[PDB]
Amino acid sequence: PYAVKVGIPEFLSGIGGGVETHVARLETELGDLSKLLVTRTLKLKKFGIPCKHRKLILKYSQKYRLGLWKPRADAIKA
Template identity: 65%
Template sequence: MAALAHVRRLLLHPGAGAPARSFYAQPYQAKVGVVEFLNGVGKGVETHAAKLEEAVGGDLQRLLETRTLRLKKLGVPVKHRKLILSFAHKYRLGLWKPPAEPRKAQ
């Protein structure tokens, strides 16, 4: 009986069984550049802005797809690599955007 009620609810309300948010990687337009992204992360990561911008050709999409080994080869310390990768993942999911003004290093 419960299964019948569930099927009826899905037929009457088509969006009821769908997930609230899609976590599939979607192509997005680079609304901010590499420097703005790193300034938004803050915590000293912006010191690597020139090096990373040159390595990825100024393309934010390439920075977001960069893996930890490439960052390591560029000489980015572990703490900063973790921050860059963490914020890149949040940005891809749409959970974080760089603020208008850069964060101060602590």
């Protein structure tokens, strides 16, 4: 039920809550999802991501790296 190949856009679309508007900027500046999983708040603040979206991205990065959460594969057809 989860996405097999997970990148930055699948991760951010699985988080939801309007945070998927920063897919293009985070692809341009961070590129790799493994870089995003260890990005902290000052770097995301420099990229123009607001407070609640920053906190959501960091929360689900910590959840994803521990196995506690995976993005669902049902968000494949836009």
